[PDB]
Amino acid sequence: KPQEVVRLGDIQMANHLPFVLFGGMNVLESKDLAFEIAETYIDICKRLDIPYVFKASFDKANRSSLHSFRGPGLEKGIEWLGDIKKHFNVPIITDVHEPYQAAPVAEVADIIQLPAFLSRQTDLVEAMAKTQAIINIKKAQFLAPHEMRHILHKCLEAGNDKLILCERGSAFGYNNLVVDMLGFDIMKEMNVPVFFDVTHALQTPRRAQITTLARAGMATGLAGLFLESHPDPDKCDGPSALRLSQLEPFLAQLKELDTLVKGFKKLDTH
Amino acid sequence: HHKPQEVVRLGDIQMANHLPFVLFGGMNVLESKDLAFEIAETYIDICKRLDIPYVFKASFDKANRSSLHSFRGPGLEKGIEWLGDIKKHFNVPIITDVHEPYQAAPVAEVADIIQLPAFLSRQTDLVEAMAKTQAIINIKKAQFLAPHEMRHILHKCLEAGNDKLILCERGSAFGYNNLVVDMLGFDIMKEMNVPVFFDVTHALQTPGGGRRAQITTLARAGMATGLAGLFLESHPDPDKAKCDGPSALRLSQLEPFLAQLKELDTLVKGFKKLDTH
């Protein structure tokens, strides 16, 4: 069985508890931008009292072209992640793209993220589970909610019970995602923390719509939110990045909605 | 005669996307005169104590059932009589759906809001005959139409001289025998500057494929986007409802359901709007 309340030192993540923020940037553009963005997140989450985990990729492994910017790479990113972790004493979450990378990533990262497209790749899942870090499972665009249980079951079989499921939209026809809010209940009924990646659910593979979608998801009662920002969204996924100057009022509303929704008695309408 | 009304008024009631949400609530079909009175009384009392504006909803005819022999309700003449009886006895406004152009004028005598069914929303003669009555028009968004396509149906209503128009979401076809609600679609319909409603009841359907246990989660998600109102069907015993019982809310649970949505709506309508363009 998976852990219903996933603990990370001081932080407790669960669908009935105050929501936790996995927040940061899409990719490590530079040391100075990462430090600036982290400082902005930590300060805001401290004043709003939202538990916080810093998020950034060391590699964009699945871009369209071989020449697209991929980031600092494994060696430099893991080194840079430690710099952010040691200076601020903040947890780290990043994604893992090849099985061998799991253990070296686990030294620095408190939560290791399983990318959507790779969530079925057994070698990557087994290697990630072995490190014993928390595992954030990105729900694939092509998988139905009930299919999440097998990814949990494979993780449990591989000896890891610190598991989080993260919604990021479902394929809706061509070049378009929809978020089925009814899917949140199905995943919550698996008794794991459930997160919503609002940033990547806007994609039309809609920055003005991030507020609408985050509210709808968090109104269902979720363990946390996954969010990316940038001071000037115009090096990767800029159309989905939230203008960093808008972070605090955005988080403040979500904090208030969550508080209302988390205090509701669950209602059985069977 | 070009623009629709951003605020739709019905006596004391005001419907708009920035205003407190309004409930179109009742039952799927007029199963009997006595049950309709009981259901209306129950909605009216709950909405008064919770302070939620209310319009009673019930169909007089199920025009699109699976079989020729399926239960259809009282029909036009008797159904209009029951709706008027409810309206006069309770002093409550009425919404019901219209299926043929000739039904439009007699239904509008009793119904303050006349509903355009999803499958029929493009049928020009029905849309025109409905527009002519000058009643409020509730447009059900078809399972197969994208949000931006609602603009043409508004224009057709406006062309026929009616500007009291509401758009009501009820799910989109998602593969076979399944609906999904695209919450991003609400913003597109609101930018048309008409009141936009959410029919949570029919957005649960798995047509030809119930999900009654998920109604609260879905209604919370929709109303958190900030909408003009909610469309809802209930029944004292949904297993025996004469149509769409699998999606009906247990009447005994109406009050705690609405109570949560009332506070959520108040919270959301009170947020400062945020420019993220």
Next chain:
Amino acid sequence: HHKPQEVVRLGDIQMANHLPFVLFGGMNVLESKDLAFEIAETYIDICKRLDIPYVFKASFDKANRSSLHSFRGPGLEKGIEWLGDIKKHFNVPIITDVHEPYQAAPVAEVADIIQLPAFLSRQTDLVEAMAKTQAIINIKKAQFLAPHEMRHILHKCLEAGNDKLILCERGSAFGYNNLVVDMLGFDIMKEMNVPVFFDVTHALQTPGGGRRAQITTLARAGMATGLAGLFLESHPDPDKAKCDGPSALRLSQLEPFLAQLKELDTLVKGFKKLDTH
């Protein structure tokens, strides 16, 4: 009165999934009496030389256009006159669509096959009034209905006493503003033991989103599954067709298009059936 006819007969013509394919072909709407005569003559000559059974198709009314002012065609009285004129002059059978229950009986005087529009395929009064006329019924499969759901519409037609029934594929909603044809859906409808047709013209649509250049590939794929017939709209100048011009086949290309499909059909209908269960 329980079972539908596996072989649907119309004088000399026989329609069934194991028989040579039949063409329901013509134009989207009766744009004018003269153009309808020209188009009918062109189909009839080509089908005779290629030896393809033929039914002339044209709508007398576009009942579901975007605007109240969009071109709708001649309407009921005049359209029925033009269809009868074509029928008597050319000695050709007629298929046209029916939009309201009262239109069913007068249309059936002239039309040998009456067509049930997709959006209306569940409307009980229309289905019954159509069934009563005892004409052949062409059922358009709605963009939002799964194949197995056609069984209920057949049953409703049978309940109302008509067993001359055809199912016609025309695409399924695939996300927003897009249709896909599920070729596996053809087998499900054929196992209902009725003739199954393919409306390749409307399966190209990108509704609210043309694909005229892909019509041959799509028609070949469908007819390779082994079908009772094809539904097709053409126009001498598709850019100026009064409705659905983006999906119309250029009339000058009708003969090479049909010639390929004729040989493909003959090949496929002559294959030994194979049990892979």
Next chain:
Amino acid sequence: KPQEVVRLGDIQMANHLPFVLFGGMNVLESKDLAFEIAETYIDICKRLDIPYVFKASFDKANRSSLHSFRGPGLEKGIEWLGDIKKHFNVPIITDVHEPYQAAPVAEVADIIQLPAFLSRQTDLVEAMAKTQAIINIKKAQFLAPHEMRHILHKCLEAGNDKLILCERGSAFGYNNLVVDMLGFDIMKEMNVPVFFDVTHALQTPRRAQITTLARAGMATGLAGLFLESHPDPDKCDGPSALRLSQLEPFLAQLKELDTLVKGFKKLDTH
């Protein structure tokens, strides 16, 4: 630019040419079953005059459970593939799951297959392209047809021009695939050989329906077909495996349809 006609020694693959068969089994169950199945394919394709490439995976890398049968693995499969290749003098096609495997797989395999879920992973694509074998691109369930160009463009940027696109269905709602036959024209208009994997397009993640679907796809005019069989479909993907005793009449019909369709003058209906 990619090669419009992809050559493999004696075999020529192109959308206007006689269709080529990539045929075999889902997974290498055992040496005896693989030898028996290959013998049956080679004999039938010889008598029907259909050019043939033998297909089998050495690993099922993306199964639901860690304990599901995965096959002989890399070392044994590459060794076993050589046994099939040397005895019969038949080309080999198999799929590659991790970047390092590309070069060792390329020694034995004439065509290396890019799995659908991984088609966007740059490290795997680059490593596969480097080996200079033919690359069969499985079109992801979540990608639209026009998106195939980037996978070609990345391959060309990586110095490989022997490219094949292979359709295998698109996500249609939950747990269901549909094959959009209009997508074949879009991929053919990219001037590469286009194949149809009918076996995996039946999936409802329908054995009696394989005949219907293969005919519809091949009626559009394709460079080839991808097909899996098993003597008793009841160790992997058995619901989609064709009963081996039915192979020859199935192929005979497709040979006849292809001949008709390939002789049609292309018709411009713009």
